[PDB]
Amino acid sequence: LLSGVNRHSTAIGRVWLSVIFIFRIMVLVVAAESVWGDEKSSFICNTLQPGCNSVCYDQFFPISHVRLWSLQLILVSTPALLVAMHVAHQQHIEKKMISGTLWWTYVISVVFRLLFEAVFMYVFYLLYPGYAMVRLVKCDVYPCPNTVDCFVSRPTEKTVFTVFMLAASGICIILNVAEVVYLIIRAC
Amino acid sequence: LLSGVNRHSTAIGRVWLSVIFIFRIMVLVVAAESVWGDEKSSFICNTLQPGCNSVCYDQFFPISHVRLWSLQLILVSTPALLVAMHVAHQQHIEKKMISGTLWWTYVISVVFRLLFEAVFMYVFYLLYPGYAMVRLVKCDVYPCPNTVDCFVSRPTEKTVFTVFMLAASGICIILNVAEVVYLIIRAC
Amino acid sequence: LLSGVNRHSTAIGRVWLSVIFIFRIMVLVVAAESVWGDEKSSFICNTLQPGCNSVCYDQFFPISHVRLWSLQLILVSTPALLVAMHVAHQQHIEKKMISGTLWWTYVISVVFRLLFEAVFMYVFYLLYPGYAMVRLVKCDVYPCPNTVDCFVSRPTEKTVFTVFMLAASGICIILNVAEVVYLIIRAC
Amino acid sequence: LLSGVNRHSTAIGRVWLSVIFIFRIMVLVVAAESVWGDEKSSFICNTLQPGCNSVCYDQFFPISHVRLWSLQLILVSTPALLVAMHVAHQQHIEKKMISGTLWWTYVISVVFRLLFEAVFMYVFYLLYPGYAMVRLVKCDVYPCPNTVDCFVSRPTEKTVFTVFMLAASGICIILNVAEVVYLIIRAC
Amino acid sequence: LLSGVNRHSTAIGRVWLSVIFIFRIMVLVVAAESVWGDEKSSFICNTLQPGCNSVCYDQFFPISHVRLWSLQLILVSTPALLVAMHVAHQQHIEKKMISGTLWWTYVISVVFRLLFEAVFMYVFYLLYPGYAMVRLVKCDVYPCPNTVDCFVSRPTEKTVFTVFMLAASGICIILNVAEVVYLIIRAC
Amino acid sequence: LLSGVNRHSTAIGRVWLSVIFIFRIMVLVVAAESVWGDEKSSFICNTLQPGCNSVCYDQFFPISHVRLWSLQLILVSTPALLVAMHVAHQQHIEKKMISGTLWWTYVISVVFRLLFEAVFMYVFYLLYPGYAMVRLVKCDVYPCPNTVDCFVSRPTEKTVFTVFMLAASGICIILNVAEVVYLIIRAC
Predict the structure, then answer these.
(1) Which end of chain F has fewer beta carbons closer than 10 Å to its terminal beta carbon, N or C?
(2) What DSSP designation does D148 have?
């Protein structure tokens, strides 16, 4: 399951990480179509050149925030689901017919989840510097003549939800670091 | 679960809070897309300047009422879900192998839920003073020249639903205060 | 549950009220988006003044019929759900460790359901006198100059569904009165 | 349930009526939004008069075929659900603490279902004489000047689905008559 | 269930027919709204005559491919559901209180499914000769003056999905013929 | 089920293939309507010729990426579902009244899944050479006069999702090859 447990997860990996993951899922669900639903259609530019709106939008939004967060959530949830599948497979094999391997697998899964969180946060920072979206953008790309003034839709609400998601991801990273440190200390 | 119980919840925290939470959930579901569905598209201004509608809408509606209430509900439901997860974890631990800690955790959860309710109500008051929405708004923000007359969509229905949601949240705050007071009195 | 039972509900409160409630729910579901889906967009007025359509629509439809009926259904279903929750709470308390209190609670719940039905019917009568909707409406409200001719969408179908819902609500009121009278007679 | 059974239903009331009801439900589901989805928006008239399209559509389609069939299905399913609820209530009463009364109740339920089928078919015949829909309609109603040429959307597909639904309803009426006759013969 | 079994179905009627039916269901689900969603709105003609688009579309598409395939699937699934209902009824009757009748019923059901498949394929061939859809169509029907050039939307994707569905239906017909032949041979 | 098991599946066919299949399903679900939803409507060309947009779109997108991936996923999942159905049928037959045949069936199923993956990847390469989509396309097809400049919607996001899906399919092909080799080695 999401942020799955393996009989080795501590309190900060069984109680808090699941809560944060569910919170992110719910926020993404309630903001996926309400806020970013009309990101393309409401996006208009101040020009008479045909086809300038689409090229400007693709220039300033290479990949939307909602879909980037969706990919991040899917890739974060993948290792936990893989660990759960492996545990079920091992149980089935034992029934048809070990703790250290499971412990190391869980540690590697937490490490990979932390790595995915960090790389997705870095990608988000690289694509969209800053936490705020501006109402007006200046675009100079073919076929738009010289520079044109395009207007983004709902910058303030998108900024609020971006702050929420970034804070949640930072909390997830901190909790993953704490979980890794606690497991290492307990093992030694 | 929503407004969860911990074997320590009284009648005013097990029977009434859950009913109010379900009522708020149902109202938000039946008003999320019906009323606020076309808040952006039906919103039009009396100008010929391109891009003025979007900037005016973002100026007068930094974050929509529906999404603000959704975030409030999610953050209110988070502590109860966390407490339920902790209780399940403790039961699993005891099975694999205490009342005062659970009591204090429940008290802290109720306090945090009350705090979230109060802070969200204060934020709603700060963003949107008053309980009523006007049909006509005067907007003077770039690129709109001087002052322009924008028209809101369905102000009366939104006012009615705002009154409903605010009354429900006030009842929730009162019930949380009563629950905290009753628990403190019973403990002492 | 909807029009819930408490081991004290008679034949006219266990068999007929539930059927009527389910009938109203199904009618509202099949008419919520099909008929009232384009109540705002198809609504057009005979003027060139920008922003007159929205103000006219808000003037003649302070709150749509579908959402008014939805609120009525939610508030009618609330007392039954509260009674069911209280019964479950009492059963849990007795298991962890009375008929007259349950009987009085059920009577009060039926009374409150009747009161909500009556008040919502009165509100519907006050907002929309008569059972029929006209195709043409004359509106004289700012910014529309003098009087303008607005045209409602699907008045006949909305009239038919209004007749259905009003008849169902009247049957509900009659059955609630009969249930209260029968319980009073049986008790005495 | 739909076309419910009461331990007294024969082969033509337990096996065939349920199949026909499910067939009608599936046809209505697959034709509700695909065919009649854009009945109002694609409906256009050959005039420059504002507001003529809506009045013409309301004149020629007082209530759409899909919603009429939905109401017919709901009212047909109501007596069976009521009988099932009564049977469950009687079983609960007997457990807490008769065949002829149940038999008469089932007979009355079948009679009422037949009556609803007949009255809805008659209403459909009265509102829409014939089985075919024409592409062109002549409308002379205020505010449209003199006579205007309105164009219906997808008349052929709607005619095909109307034929399907009418044939299914006729089969239902025949089967209900056969069930009543068979029960009367068996009883005597 | 879909392509149901009756303890008499062989390998080619229990393993392969169900797979083909599920494949057709999934293809229809993934192509119902994605491809044929905007068949009417994207359909435009090269004329200034009002109302010509709708009459041309109804002329060239009497009933859409998606809805024709949906009706075919419903009518194919009907006999299997009827047989399953009859088997359940017989089991209930025996519990309350034969193989040859069930065998003959299954044979008749397979024959009727084959007949429905063949008749629907013939109807599809009669309405739409060939397997390919052309981009341009010449339409000469009132009120369009003389001949007009209408343009179909997504002809290539619709051709691909038509080929898929026709191949699947042909495989279904072949498997039904094989099942009937195998049952006849085994019986004799 | 998806990438089903047959008691003969190894670790790389029970744990990893299922994870990759679920990842592809989730990516397709979250990108089906968000990215490719307005592929046709937002697609505009720089011409005044009516009907040129639709013919140009059909020329440059014979079948959309989302539906091609959906067909690929359905055809990949078909053999596993068929194998599961056959296993259930064999279990039912044995209950009513072998390992080598099941092993060979599983091997053939894996081979067919690999073949479908390879053929769909080759088809995708043939239809859309390269991994990137360009903003501007030059189209010269009737009725568009000479060459016209059409503009694609969201090329960068579609490129990102294409890279994701192609990488996932390549991983699936590699894992299928490894599974076949491992089974062959273990058998010999």
Answers:
(1) C
(2) E
Do D and B touch, 3+ Cβ pairs within 8 Å? The answer is: no
Chains that touch B (3 or more CB pairs under 8 A): A, C
Provide the edge-to-edge strand list for the sheet that holds C148-151.
C44-45, C148-151, C136-139
Instruction: Calculate the alpha carbon distances from B76 to B29, B66, C62, D93 in Å.
Output: 17, 15, 31, 42
- Retrieve residue D95's tokens: 């457990």
Q: Quick check: B137 contacting C, CB < 8 Å?
A: no
Q: Which residues of F touch E3 (CB under 8 A)?
A: none
Distance (Å, rounded) from C-alpha B149 to C-alpha C66?
A: 30
CA–CA distances in Å: residue C46 to residues C145, C149, D27: 11, 5, 40
Flag whether residue B127 sits within 8 Å of chain A, measured between CB atoms. Answer: no
Q: Which two tokens stand for residue D22?
A: 């499910």
B27 and chain C in contact, CB less than 8 A: yes
The letter for the amino acid at C45 is: C
Residue of B134, B111, B120 whose CA lies nearest to B165: B120
d(CA C79, CA C82): 5
Q: Are E59 and D47 in contact (CB under 8 A)?
A: no
Helix or strand holding residue A104 (H, E)? helix A99-127
H or E element that contains F54: helix F52-60
d(CA C157, CA C155): 6
Q: What is the DSSP string of F106-139?
A: HHHHHHHHHHHHHHHHHHHHHHS-SS---SEEEE
Which residues make Cβ contacts (< 8 Å) with residue C77, sequence separation at least 6? Answer: C2, C3, C21
**DSSP designation for B142:** T
Residue D14 and residue F114: Cα distance in Å, rounded?
47
The resolution in angstroms reads 3.1
> Which stretch of DSSP H or E encloses residue F150?
strand F148-151
Helix (H) or strand (E) holding E87: helix E65-96
Residues 6+ apart with CB under 8 A from C118: C173
| C-alpha span between B124 and D57 (Å, rounded) | 43
Q: Which residues are paired to B148 by β-bridges? A: B139
Neighbours of A54 (CB within 10 A): 21
Nearest Cα to Cα of residue D23 among B33, E78, A125: E78
CB-closest option in F16, F26, F46 to A51: F46
Give the chain F residue whose CA is nearest to the CA of E48.
Answer: F50
Q: How far apart are CA B20 and CA B28, in angstroms?
A: 12
Question: Residues F35, A61: contact at Cβ < 8 Å?
Answer: no
Q: CB of B9 within 8 A of CB of B128?
A: no
Dist. CA E117–CA E110, nearest whole Å: 11
B–C contact (≥3 CB pairs within 8 Å)?
yes
Q: What CA–CA distance (Å, rounded) separates D13 from F146?
A: 67
**Angle between helical axes of A155-187 and B52-60 (0-180°, round to 10):** 60
Q: Cα–chain-centroid distance for residue F31?
A: 14
- Which method resolved this structure? cryo-EM
> B85 and A14 in contact by Cβ < 8 A?
yes
B150 and B53 in contact (C-beta within 8 Å)?
yes
Burial of A173 (0-12, 13-18, 19+ CB in 10 A): middle
Q: What is the DSSP secondary structure assignment for residue E88, as one 8-state letter?
A: H
Angle between helices A52-60 and F155-187 (to 10 degrees): 60
The number of residues in chain A equals: 188
Sorted by sequence, the CB contacts under 8 Å of residue D142 that are 6+ apart come out as C136, D55
Name which of E19, E23, E44 is nearest F51 (Cβ-Cβ): E44
Which stretches of chain B are DSSP H helices? 11-14, 16-32, 52-60, 65-96, 99-127, 155-187
> What is the amino acid identity at position A115?
L
